[PDB]
Amino acid sequence: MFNDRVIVKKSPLGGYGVFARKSFEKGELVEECLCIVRHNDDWGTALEDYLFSRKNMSAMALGFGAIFNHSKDPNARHELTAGLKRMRIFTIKPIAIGEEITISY
Amino acid sequence: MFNDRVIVKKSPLGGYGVFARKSFEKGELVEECLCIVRHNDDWGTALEDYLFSRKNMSAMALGFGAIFNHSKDPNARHELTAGLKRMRIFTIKPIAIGEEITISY
Numbered sequence: 348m349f350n351d352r353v354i355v356k357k358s359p360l361g362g363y364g365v366f367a368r369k370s371f372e373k374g375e376l377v378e379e380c381l382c383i384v385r386h387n388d389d390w391g392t393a394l395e396d397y398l399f400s401r402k403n404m405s406a407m408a409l410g411f412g413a414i415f416n417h418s419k420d421p422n423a424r425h426e427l428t429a430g431l432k433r434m435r436i437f438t439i440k441p442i443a444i445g446e447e448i449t450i451s452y
Numbered sequence: 453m454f455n456d457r458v459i460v461k462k463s464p465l466g467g468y469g470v471f472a473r474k475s476f477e478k479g480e481l482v483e484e485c486l487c488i489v490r491h492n493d494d495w496g497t498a499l500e501d502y503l504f505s506r507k508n509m510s511a512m513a514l515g516f517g518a519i520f521n522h523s524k525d526p527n528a529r530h531e532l533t534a535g536l537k538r539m540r541i542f543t544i545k546p547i548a549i550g551e552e553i554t555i556s557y
């Protein structure tokens with residue numbers, strides 16, 4: 348699974364992760380994806396570690412959105428629209444090819 | 453949400469759908485994406501209309517995989533690996549720019 352800027356591979360952090368296929372400057376858009384949004388009570392345990400929540404709603408990011416791993420020292424950030432319908436991942440520091448792209452906890 | 457070959461837009465079939473940005477030949481790969489796989493009982497009602505199931509396991513396709521709409525007269529098909537970890541969408545007939553890409557039921 349990949350495109351012109353990122354590729355998904357096995358990550359040392361466990362499971363799968365998103366890696367840069369090209370260089371990224373700070374603040375550059377890495378991924379923009381749509382999310383499926385539903386009341387918190389509609390979600391089972393299946394996607395607990397991937398869902399993003401706000402109030403009584405949770406959203407599952409499609410595209411590459413849910414694949415980005417978390418980290419105590421991330422090089423990217425996620426951003427969600429008001430209704431949690433769209434997610435964007437931006438770099439918060441330069442990123443070189445082969446480096447894993449991670450977001451905060 | 454889009455890439456060099458497909459774009460997501462509102463579909464007359466309801467909600468969102470995946471549309472062709474370029475022409476597709478018969479049998480051409482439209483999308484390849486990873487899926488999150490969990491026991492059927494781990495899933496709530498949230499994604500029941502998107503999940504693909506085999507035996508006691510269900511899988512949620514990431515990338516553009518879960519966005520393709522279903523149709524009685526589709527122009528594409530889906531294919532899952534044995535463990536349901538990867539999904540591929542292939543055209544089953546030529547597809548022209550602007551046409552919605554749909555799969556069977």
Ligand SMILES: [Cl-]
Nearest residue numbers: 390391495496
């Ligand atoms: Cl769920």
